[PDB]
Amino acid sequence: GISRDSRHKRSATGAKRAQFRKKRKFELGRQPANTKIGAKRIHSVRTRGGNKKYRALRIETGNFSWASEGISKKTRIAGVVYHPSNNELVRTNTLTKAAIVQIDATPFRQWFEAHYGQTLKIESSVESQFSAGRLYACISSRPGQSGRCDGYILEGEELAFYLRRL
Amino acid sequence: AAPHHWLLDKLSGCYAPRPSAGPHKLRESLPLIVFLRNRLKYALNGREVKAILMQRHVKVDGKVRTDTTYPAGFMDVITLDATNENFRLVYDVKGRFAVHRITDEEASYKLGKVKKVQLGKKGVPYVVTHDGRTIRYPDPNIKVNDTVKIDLASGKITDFIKFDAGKLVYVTGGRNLGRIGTIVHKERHDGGFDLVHIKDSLDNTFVTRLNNVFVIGEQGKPYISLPKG
Amino acid sequence: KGRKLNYSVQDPIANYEAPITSGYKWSDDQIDEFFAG
Amino acid sequence: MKLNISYPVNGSQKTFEIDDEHRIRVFFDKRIGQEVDGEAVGDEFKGYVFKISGGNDKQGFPMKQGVLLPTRIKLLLTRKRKSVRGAIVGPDLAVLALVIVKKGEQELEGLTDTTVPKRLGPKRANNIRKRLQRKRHQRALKVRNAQAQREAAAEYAQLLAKRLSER
Amino acid sequence: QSERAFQKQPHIRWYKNAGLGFKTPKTAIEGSYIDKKCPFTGLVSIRGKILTGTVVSTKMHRTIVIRRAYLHYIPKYNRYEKRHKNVPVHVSPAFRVQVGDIVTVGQCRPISKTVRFNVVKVS
Amino acid sequence: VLKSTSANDVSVYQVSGTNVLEYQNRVELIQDFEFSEASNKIKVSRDGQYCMATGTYKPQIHVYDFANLSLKFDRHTDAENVDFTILSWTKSVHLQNDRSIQFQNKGGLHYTTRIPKFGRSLVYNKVNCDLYVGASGNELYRLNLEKGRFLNPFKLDTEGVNHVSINEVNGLLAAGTETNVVEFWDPRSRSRVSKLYLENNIDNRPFQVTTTSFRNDGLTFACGTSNGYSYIYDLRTSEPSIIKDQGYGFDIKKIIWLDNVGTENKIVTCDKRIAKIWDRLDGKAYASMEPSVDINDIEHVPGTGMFFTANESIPMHTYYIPSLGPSPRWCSFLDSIT
RNA sequence: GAUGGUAGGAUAGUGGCCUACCAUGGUUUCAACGGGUAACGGGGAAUAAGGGUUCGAUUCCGGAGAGGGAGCCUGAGAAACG
RNA sequence: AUACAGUGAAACUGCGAAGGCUCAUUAAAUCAGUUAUCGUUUAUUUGAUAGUUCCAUGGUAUAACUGUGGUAA
C-alpha cells in the first residue's frame, strides 16, 4: 500500500496545487496480503508499540459456525466462486472476509449423527450438501488483520440469497 | 512561559516548570515546586524543595507522593506534617489558585465530580473522578456531574451530592472560571452552552458548560469551608 | 472508465528501449511460405 | 603454506611452515569437513588424518564452512557486505587449520608428547555432580493474598447487594 | 430491498436508541429497512453537536445537502452579508426530504470523505 | 555428497530443500535464498549471472549475483506480483495482481503505469519493442517501448487468456484462452492468422489452456491445459497432436524446452506439485523432480543442467541433473561435491 | 475518484485512503476556483513597559536535507542528524 | 578468612548525548483556539484489578579466559 491522507487527492470543492509533503510514518499502508490456501503461515508484524498483528496468507483450518445452533467447528477450504469486491479475486481463488467459500462438511455430519443419532427439519438445498459433502459458508474473521479464518454456514435464506446471485 | 492560574511573579526565571503526568491535566493544576517554593514560600529554590520532598513532609490526598512536579489540581488537600498544615486549594474569582487553610476533619475527605458510570467488565458498577479514583459500587442514581465524597483513608464514597436544579455549584472552566452563587437560572441545551447559571452581588447572569461546572453543596450549607475577605 | 485506458503518451518509456533492423532471422517470404496454411 | 594442527582431546595445537607445495597439493580442491591422509602431505606423519577447519588466506580473509567458489566473494554476515574467501582450499592460503583425529606412526614433541590441562572444575550443582524457607514464605504469602483479595471482593459485592436491596 | 451481495443485514429487526430528544419512527424500530448508518438502529453512536437548516439538493441517494444561513454580527462594513453553508448527509426512513424542509443533524463518525452528520428530525 | 532421489535409472539432486554433522558439512550454494514463507516467480537473466526472484509477503525483487553467490538487493514493490520479464542488463518490467505495471531500473521504479483490466501475463518483443500483455476478456494490450504509446488492442474471445508468448525466430503470437482455442495472432499484421482448437480423448470438463511455449526452430509449439495434459503441435497436420496425461494432473504451468544444451528433443513439464521431463517423438519420461511442497513455477538455467523453482515454502529448491549436463562456471565445484 | 452508495484490502482505528461493481454527481454572484508582494513580512504568536502611540517582547515564514533520488530496519514516539 | 571477601587497566551490563545549520517562496489547507473519538495508539504519572492436577529442584551450549595463527590494516 501507500497512504491514508486526503492531501494527495481532491476534496468536495475541486482544489489543485497540492505538492504538499514528504509522507509520514502514520500514513502507513502495508502491502495487500491476499490470503490463500496452502500450509498455515502467519506473519507476525509489529505496529503501535507491542501491537502484534497476525497477517495470514495460507490459512486452512476454518472455524465455521453451524447457524441454527451456533456450532463453530473446524474444517478445510476449497475455493470462492463469487466475490465482486474484485471479480478477479475469485478467478485467482484467494480467501478474504465476507467471501462465500466451499467446505467439506464431514465434521458437521459427525456432529449431526452424534447429537441426533440418525443420518440424512433442515432445508433441502442444504440437505443436498449434507448428503454430498461440500456446503457453502461465508468468512467472518479477518485473516489480514486478526490472522484467523472463522465463518458462518449458509442455511436457507442466506443460501438462496447467494444462489440467486451466482 | 507560564499560565495564569499559578499566581507566578514575572521576575522569577526563564524556564517554567512543566508539571509531570498525574491525576489532573496540565492545564488545571499546579505542581509542588510552584506551590511550596514561590507561592507560600516554604523553600527558596529547587534544591531545597527537593530536599524537603526527600524528607517527605508532603501528604497530598493522604499519601506522601515525593515529587517536584506532581500536578496538584482542584481541591487536593495538601497536608504537611510539621505545624499540621492542612491546605485545600480552590479557584478564586479571577482565575488563580486560592489555597485556603482548613482543619483536620475537613482534610479527612475531599469531593469529586463523577465523569462516567460504566458496566465495564463482570457486572461491576464503576465511577471515575478528576483525580481518577476508580472506586467500587455507587448507587444506580449516579448521573454525570454529581459529586462523590472520597474517604481519604480508604477510597470509598461516603456521601453523595445529586446534581439538580437548586444545588450549589462550582465553575472551573471558560470565561466563568471560579465563580460561586449557582442560582439565577437553569438551562440544559442539547450540546453546548448548557448549565446552571450563577448569581453575582447584583445577581447577574452567566453561561458555561456542563463539564466546566461541578457541585459542592447546598444553598447555604456546603460542608467544604470556603475562604473569605 | 476514468483511469481505465488512458490513451496518452508517457515520459520515461518513450525511449526506454531501441528497435532492431533485421529482427527475425527468417524472411517475411519465409513467413508467407511458412503459414500459407 | 603454514599448517595449523590441533589435537583436541589432549589440548595441543601448533603451526608448521611446510614449503614444497607438491606435499601441499593433497589438500587442493577439498572443501571444509572432508578428511585427508597424512600419506600425501608428509612421509614422517603416516597414518594421520586431519579434518580441515578453515583457514585465513593471505590478505587475512577467513573462509566460512561450506559455500562454494574458492576465490573471494562478498556475502552478508553478522547484515552488511563482508568479504569472505570460499570454503574450498586452493594454492593461495596463508594458514590452513587442521584437526588430527588419529595419531599415526610418529610421536610429535609438539602435539602428542606435550599437552596442556583444562581450566577449572564446575560451579553449578548439577555440573559438579554430572531455598526451602523461601518455599515456606512463597506459599504463605500466596494463600494470604488469596484470603485477602478473594474475600474482600465479595465483601464489597455484598455492599452492592445492600445498595440493590435498598434501591 | 436487496440490490447488492454479501448478506445485506443489520450487524448486531435490530433496534436501539441514541436518546437525547430525537424520536425513532416505528418503521425504523421494526421495519424491513436495514439502517446501516442511520443512527437510530445503525452502527454509529451519537455525540458532538446538532446543526439545523434547509436543503439545496437531494439528487443522489444517501446524500442530503443541507443549506445553513445564519446571522453573524459583522463589524467591518457594518452590515450583515448573509451566510450560506453546505453539508452532505445520509438518508433516514422517516422523510423524503424535498426542496425547503428545514431539518437538523447530529455529529457522528465520518461516513464518507465529507459527512459527519445524519438526519434525526424533520419538521 | 548430497543424497539423490530414486528415479528411472537416473540421478537428480536438490540444493536448498526443506531438509537442506549437516551443519558442519553444509552444502549451501546461494546465501540468503529464503523468502517470507512462499515464492512467486524465479527466472535467470540472459547473461551468465543475475537471477531474479519475485517476493511473497512485502514482495521484493531479489536479484542474486551468481558470481557472488548471494543477494544484491530487495526492492519491496508496492503490490503483489504474478508475472514479469527481464529486458537486458539492469532493466525489467513487471505487472502485479492489480492492473498496474512497474518498470524497475538500476535505481529501481522508473515508472508505474496501468492497464484497464486485470492482467495475467506479459511478454516482450525484441523486434520493434512492444510488450504484449494478456488480461481478462476481449483485451490483449500493447505497451510499446518505442514512443510509449498504446496500440489498438487485440480483440479476443469472451473470457480471456491465461498466457501469451511470441515465437523467437519468426514471431508468432500465442494466447492461451479459456475455450480451448489458442488464437494465434501475427506480430507483423496485427491480425489473427489461426484459431486452432485443442482436443483430447477423456474430456473431463471444459479445460482451459494455461501454458504456451515455442523454441528456436520456429516450427513447433508446446501447449498446456488446466488439467495436467501436455500437448505438442506443428503445422504438419495441425489438427491432431501428441498428448501427455500426468499422474496427478491439476494444472500445468511451466512447459519449457531443452533447445540450447545437449541431450536433445527433451522438454520439461511442470504442474502444481511435480515437474517432469520427457523426450519428443515418443512421449516417455526422462526424469522427474518431486519436491516436498507444491510449486508456484520453475525455470531452467541455460547452457547447463540445473533448475530453479519457486514454491510455497521458505526456501527455493535448485535441482541439478549430472546426466543432462554439468554444473555452470559459477557452480563449478558442484561436480566436485556431488 | 470528480460526487455518493455496497463490499473487501490496509489501518492505530473513522474515512473513495486504495480496488471491483453501480448511480452522474458536487462547489459557485449569499463570492467557487484562480492572480502577488514592504507572505527577511504578516497574522494576537505573546510579554508588556507610569507618555515611544503601527521602533518598543517572542513562537512560526512554507516544507525539506544530512552527497543524489530508491528500498528496508529499530522504537511508547521516527519513514532517525546517531 | 585453603569454595566468595579491598585497590582495580580492558570486556559484558544500567543509562549518557533527551533535540543543531542551510536552501526553494505555502493566503485560515502554514498556524492559533475549539467540538469529538462507545472513530483510535499509548512507555512513564495516578486510582483500581487473577481459582481446570490417573500408573527437596530440571539440559547442553557459548562467552570472558587460555592457546595456535593469518593480514599492510
Curated annotation (Swiss-Prot), chain A:
Chain segments annotated as transmembrane: none
Keyword Cytoplasm applies: yes
Binding partners and assembly: Component of the small ribosomal subunit (SSU). Mature yeast ribosomes consist of a small (40S) and a large (60S) subunit. The 40S small subunit contains 1 molecule of ribosomal RNA (18S rRNA) and 33 different proteins (encoded by 57 genes). The large 60S subunit contains 3 rRNA molecules (25S, 5.8S and 5S rRNA) and 46 different proteins (encoded by 81 genes).
Signal peptide feature range: none
Extra facts: Present with 15900 molecules/cell in log phase SD medium. There are 2 genes for eS8 in yeast.
Protein name according to UniProt: Small ribosomal subunit protein eS8A
Chief localization: cytoplasm
Listed CDD domains: Ribosomal_S8e_like
Region feature (Disordered): 1-30
Keyword terms of this UniProt record: Cytoplasm, Phosphoprotein, Ribonucleoprotein, Ribosomal protein
Residues recorded as bearing Phosphoserine in the entry: 65, 68, 72, 85, 124-125, 128, 131
GO cellular component terms listed in the entry, alphabetical order: 90S preribosome; cytosol; cytosolic small ribosomal subunit
Gene3D superfamilies: 3.10.290.70, Ribosomal protein S8e, subdomain
Summary of the function given for this chain in its UniProt record: Component of the ribosome, a large ribonucleoprotein complex responsible for the synthesis of proteins in the cell. The small ribosomal subunit (SSU) binds messenger RNAs (mRNAs) and translates the encoded message by selecting cognate aminoacyl-transfer RNA (tRNA) molecules. The large subunit (LSU) contains the ribosomal catalytic site termed the peptidyl transferase center (PTC), which catalyzes the formation of peptide bonds, thereby polymerizing the amino acids delivered by tRNAs into a polypeptide chain.
Curated annotation (Swiss-Prot), chain C:
Induction (free text): Up-regulated during cold stress and following nutrient replenishment by dilution of cells fron exhausted to fresh minimal medium.
Location of this chain's protein in the cell: Nucleus, Nucleolus
Membership in a protein family: Belongs to the AATF family.
Note: Present with 15400 molecules/cell in log phase SD medium.
Function: Involved in endoplasmic reticulum to Golgi transport. Involved in a protein-transport step blocked by brefeldin A, which disrupts the Golgi apparatus and its incoming protein flux. May also be involved for mass growth or cell proliferation.
UniProt name for this protein: Protein BFR2
Source organism of the structure: Saccharomyces cerevisiae (strain ATCC 204508 / S288c)
Span covered, complete protein: 460 to 496 of 534
Curated annotation (Swiss-Prot), chain D:
Main location: cytoplasm
Source species taxonomy: Eukaryota, Fungi, Dikarya, Ascomycota, Saccharomycotina
Protein's organism: Saccharomyces cerevisiae (strain ATCC 204508 / S288c) (Baker's yeast)
Coiled coil location: none
Keywords: Cytoplasm, Isopeptide bond, Nucleus, Phosphoprotein, Ribonucleoprotein, Ribosomal protein, Ribosome biogenesis, rRNA processing, Ubl conjugation
PROSITE patterns for this protein: RIBOSOMAL_S6E (PS00578)
Leftover remarks: Present with 66000 molecules/cell in log phase SD medium. There are 2 genes for eS6 in yeast.
GO terms, molecular function: structural constituent of ribosome
Family matches, as PANTHER family: 40S RIBOSOMAL PROTEIN S6
Signal peptide: none
Official protein name in the record: Small ribosomal subunit protein eS6A
GO BP annotations, alphabetical order: maturation of SSU-rRNA from tricistronic rRNA transcript (SSU-rRNA, 5.8S rRNA, LSU-rRNA); translation
Family listed: Belongs to the eukaryotic ribosomal protein eS6 family.
Superkingdom of the organism of origin: Eukaryota
SMART domains listed in its UniProt record: Ribosomal_S6e (SM01405)
A Pfam family assignment: Ribosomal_S6e
InterPro entries found in the cross-reference section: Ribosomal_eS6 (IPR001377), Ribosomal_eS6-like (IPR014401), Ribosomal_eS6_CS (IPR018282)
Location of cross-link Glycyl lysine isopeptide (Lys-Gly) (interchain with G-Cter in ubiquitin): 103, 118, 162
UniProtKB/Swiss-Prot annotation, chain E:
GO cellular component terms, semicolon-separated: 90S preribosome; cytosol; cytosolic small ribosomal subunit
Subcellular location: Cytoplasm
BP GO annotations: maturation of SSU-rRNA from tricistronic rRNA transcript (SSU-rRNA, 5.8S rRNA, LSU-rRNA); ribosomal small subunit assembly; translation
Residues in cross-link Glycyl lysine isopeptide (Lys-Gly) (interchain with G-Cter in ubiquitin): 8, 26, 36-37, 59, 76, 85, 113, 121
UniProt keyword list: Acetylation, Cytoplasm, Isopeptide bond, Ribonucleoprotein, Ribosomal protein, RNA-binding, rRNA-binding, Ubl conjugation
Modification note: N-terminally acetylated by acetyltransferase NatA.
GO function terms (MF aspect): rRNA binding; structural constituent of ribosome
Leader peptide range in chain numbering: none
Principal localisation: cytoplasm
CDD domains on file: Ribosomal_uS17
PROSITE patterns, per the entry: RIBOSOMAL_S17
Role according to the record: Component of the ribosome, a large ribonucleoprotein complex responsible for the synthesis of proteins in the cell. The small ribosomal subunit (SSU) binds messenger RNAs (mRNAs) and translates the encoded message by selecting cognate aminoacyl-transfer RNA (tRNA) molecules. The large subunit (LSU) contains the ribosomal catalytic site termed the peptidyl transferase center (PTC), which catalyzes the formation of peptide bonds, thereby polymerizing the amino acids delivered by tRNAs into a polypeptide chain.
Assigned protein family: Belongs to the universal ribosomal protein uS17 family.
PANTHER family tied to this protein: 40S RIBOSOMAL PROTEIN S11 FAMILY MEMBER, 40S RIBOSOMAL PROTEIN S11-RELATED
Note: There are 2 genes for uS17 in yeast.
Protein name in the entry: Small ribosomal subunit protein uS17A
